[PDB]
Amino acid sequence: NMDVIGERIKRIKEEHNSTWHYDDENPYKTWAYHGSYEVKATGSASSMINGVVKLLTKPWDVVPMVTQMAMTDTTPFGQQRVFKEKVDTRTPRPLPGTRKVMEITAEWLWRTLGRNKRPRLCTREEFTKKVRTNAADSAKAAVEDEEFWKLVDRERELHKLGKCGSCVYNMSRAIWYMWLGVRYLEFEALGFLNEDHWFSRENSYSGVEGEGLHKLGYILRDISKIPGGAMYADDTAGWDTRITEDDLHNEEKIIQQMDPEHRQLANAIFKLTYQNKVVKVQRPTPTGTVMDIISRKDQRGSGQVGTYGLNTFTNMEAQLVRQMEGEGVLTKADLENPHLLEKKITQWLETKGVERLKRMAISGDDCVVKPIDDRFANALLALNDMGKVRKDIPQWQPSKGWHDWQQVPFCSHHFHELIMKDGRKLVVPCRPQDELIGRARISQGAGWSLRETACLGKAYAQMWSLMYFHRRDLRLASNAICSAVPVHWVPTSRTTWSIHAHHQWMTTEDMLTVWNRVWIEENPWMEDKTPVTTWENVPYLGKREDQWCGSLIGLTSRATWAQNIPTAIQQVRSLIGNEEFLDYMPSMKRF
Numbered sequence: 001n002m003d004v005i006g007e008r009i010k011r012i013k014e015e016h017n018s019t020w021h022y023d024d025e026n027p028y029k030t031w032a033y034h035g036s037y038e039v040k041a042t043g044s045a046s047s048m049i050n051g052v053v054k055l056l057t058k059p060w061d062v063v064p065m066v067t068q069m070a071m072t073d074t075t076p077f078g079q080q081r082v083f084k085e086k087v088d089t090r091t092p093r094p095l096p097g098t099r100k101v102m103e104i105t106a107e108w109l110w111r112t113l114g115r116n117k118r119p120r121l122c123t124r125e126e127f128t129k130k131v132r133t134n135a136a137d138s139a140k141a142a143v144e145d146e147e148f149w150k151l152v153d154r155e156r157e158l159h160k161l162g163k164c165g166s167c168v169y170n171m172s173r174a175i176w177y178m179w180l181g182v183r184y185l186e187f188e189a190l191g192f193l194n195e196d197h198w199f200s201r202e203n204s205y206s207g208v209e210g211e212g213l214h215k216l217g218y219i220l221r222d223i224s225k226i227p228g229g230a231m232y233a234d235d236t237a238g239w240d241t242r243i244t245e246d247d248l249h250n251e252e253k254i255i256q257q258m259d260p261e262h263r264q265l266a267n268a269i270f271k272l273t274y275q276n277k278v279v280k281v282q283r284p285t286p287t288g289t290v291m292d293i294i295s296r297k298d299q300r301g302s303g304q305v306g307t308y309g310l311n312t313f314t315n316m317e318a319q320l321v322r323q324m325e326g327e328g329v330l331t332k333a334d335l336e337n338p339h340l341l342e343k344k345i346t347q348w349l350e351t352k353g354v355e356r357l358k359r360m361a362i363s364g365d366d367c368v369v370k371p372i373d374d375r376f377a378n379a380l381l382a383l384n385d386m387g388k389v390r391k392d393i394p395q396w397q398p399s400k401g402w403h404d405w406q407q408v409p410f411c412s413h414h415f416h417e418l419i420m421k422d423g424r425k426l427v428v429p430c431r432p433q434d435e436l437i438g439r440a441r442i443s444q445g446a447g448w449s450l451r452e453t454a455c456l457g458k459a460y461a462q463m464w465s466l467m468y469f470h471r472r473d474l475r476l477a478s479n480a481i482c483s484a485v486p487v488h489w490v491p492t493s494r495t496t497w498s499i500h501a502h503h504q505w506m507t508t509e510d511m512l513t514v515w516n517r518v519w520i521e522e523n524p525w526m527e528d529k530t531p532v533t534t535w536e537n538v539p540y541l542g543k544r545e546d547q548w549c550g551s552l553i554g555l556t557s558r559a560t561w562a563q564n565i566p567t568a569i570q571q572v573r574s575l576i577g578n579e580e581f582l583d584y585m586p587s588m589k590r591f
């Protein structure tokens with residue numbers, strides 16, 4: 001193994017030979033530990049609070065979930081704890097028949113996915129345009145420096161020679177350039193999966209990439225119309241730690257459809273950075289803080305360019321195999337059998353595969369499957385054997401499915417069908433309200449001025465106006481925040497890193513106009529394009545559903561807060577200073 005990772009370690013060792021040592025009291029059990037070197041402590045024990053959101057959400061000061069979200073440990077102690085819990089484990093190898101089914105399915109799935117699209121190299125200008133339009137950090141400084149691109153070219157030349165010298169994954173500028181350069185080369189070779197939307201619903205059938213949170217509920221309602229059994233949505237315990245050497249070799253098969261110059265570079269990413277990896281992890285010690293250099297041959301690096309697409313691919317593959325077992329195509333004898341008959345697997349894929357892909361919604365490790373019947377609930381032999389063991393359930397206990405698409409969890413949400421005052425139907429995303437308020441109250445980092453804080457608050461408020469307007473507390477809070485923040489201040493910083501976020505709220509455009517564009521105009525499931533001219537005609541969940549999903553409506557603390565909210569808005573306004581504000585409260589029946 002040292003012939004693939006040796007150069008990378010040698011470079012770290014030489015760069016840090018001042019403090020380099022072999023700490024023989026390292027906690028690594030399943031990862032190969034190479035050595036340590038002293039570093040400054042990174043991360044925080046708690047998170048900075050957004051004072052603007054906090055001052056306008058007083059009844060949530062006494063909410064346990066809200067308080068918990070303000071915590072989250074990112075220090076060396078925090079990193080080490082989570083590492084021990086999941087990351088430091090070994091997945092038993094799948095049986096020979098299981099490996100054969102996975103291989104046949106992976107081959108057919110890659111050909112299906114590549115039927116209209118062809119893989120291609122991503123460029124320096126694509127990465128630059130992304131880094132720019134995202135930041136509008138020190139990544140933009142690297143992208144602007146020609147010296148960064150020269151290091152990129154030098155690493156690429158090693159990659160063409162089947163070698164790696166600096167591509168290290170992380171759990172002054174030279175160390176930073178090497179990380180961003182590793183991510184650029186990964187983007188260059190595998191970015192086409194995201195950039196050319198290989199996992200869009202039109203291309204992949206099961207996929208939802210590029211669809212957006214505002215479309216997922218509509219997709220789940222469409223799946224519910226397909227005849228079959230219940231809708232299943234099983235969670236895998238630590239999916240990324242369950243990616244096997246067999247899964248990686250199956251994912252690699254995409255290189256067969258590439259141009260030779262592209263195949264060479266993607267092969268280097270697969271063989272040197274995915275199937276072999278050098279990882280940096282911070283660890284506290286009595287002496288101080290050290291960086292451990294570790295390695296392994298399996299699992300997925302969660303921060304990588306290809307992670308989402310390759311998890312989506314492998315999960316679509318694992319769900320087709322579970323569907324086959326449910327249908328009696330795959331038996332216990334077949335999974336143990338090295339000489340398993342390929343014919344019936346190939347016949348099922350070619351005649352039923354695509355129809356079976358359409359019964360699913362798959363986003364990385366998140367899946368929803370509507371099998372042809374409920375034998376699937378008890379079809380666990382292949383799922384467990386592939387290493388995709390379901391979270392917090394005995395291994396052989398049958399899965400519990402849902403007979404209502406509205407009860408189905410998917411991508412940290414559930415979805416409600418609403419009836420508007422004009423009789424039109426809307427399908428909206430939803431989650432427990434404490435999680436929404438709890439997140440909005442967290443600002444990211446330190447040294448943030450009241451201006452930047454108010455603008456992040458405005459971004460959260462506007463995200464709620466577009467996605468979660470159907471929650472009474474969030475519409476009130478959203479209007480209060482937008483009334484407290486100067487009208488012309490542009491929402492800055494992101495509210496989420498979610499691939500499902502299209503960030504329509506990142507604007508100073510009127511939110512009712514944006515609402516109309518998203519839910520009416522561009523909405524494929526909205527036949528009648530009549531605009532909604534007032535927020536008074538923008539619907540809410542039924543009062544009972546709003547309460548079931550965490551609303552404080554009907555509580556006295558909530559009525560007190562609503563009644564006294566112009567006072568809290570005025571307090572925020574007075575501290576922000578003499579700027580132009582707009583009273584958004586009259587857009588509600590209360591004012």
Ligand SMILES: O=C(O)Cc1cc(CC(=O)O)cc(-c2ccc(C#CCO)s2)c1
Nearest residue numbers: 212213214411412496498500501502503
């Ligand atoms: O990032 C967090 O702390 C929560 C979170 C999680 C997830 C699920 C996931 O991607 O795993 C989605 C979101 C979004 C909020 C609004 C969105 C939109 C839209 C339409 O343009 S997507 C937020």
Ligand SMILES: [Zn+2]
Nearest residue numbers: 164165166167
């Ligand atoms: Zn490299």
Ligand SMILES: [Zn+2]
Nearest residue numbers: 414430431549
């Ligand atoms: Zn709900």
